[PDB]
């Protein structure tokens, strides 16, 4: 379950639909990701690519990715927390992962938030 946990790397969805189901399910955890989200516009695309890459890859390829290459990365080093959504909270992530495959693929609104 570190760094990656173990839903994330098996889990079918895509990212907006793993974000979606995170808004429904734990709202507070969403709305904060949001916040710094749009507190880091110059990394928003980037953001999105890395989001998009890792959720195309395999369970093998991510347990890879996250016990030999995740940590030291550029988006980390400009951005710490840039996939905390996705990899920091167990509970946040056991919800979303739930129900994440009902949620519509690719709806780019999950990335779009304001107050």
Request: proline share 5%; glycine share 4%.
């Amino acid at each position: 379950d570190f760094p990656i946990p173990r839903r994330m790397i098996a889990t079918t969805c895509d990212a907006e639909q793993y974000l979606a189901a995170v808004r429904d399910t734990s709202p507070v955890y969403y709305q904060r990701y949001m916040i710094d989200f749009n507190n880091h516009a110059n990394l928003q695309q980037a953001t999105i690519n890395k989001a998009h890459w890792f959720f195309s890859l395999s369970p093998a390829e991510r347990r890879d990715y996250s016990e030999h290459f995740y940590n030291g990365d550029p988006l980390t080093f400009a951005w710490v927390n840039h996939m905390k959504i996705f990899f920091n909270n167990k509970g946040v992530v056991a919800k979303g992962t739930e129900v994440c495959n009902g949620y519509p693929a690719g709806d780019m609104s999950v990335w779009n938030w304001a107050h």
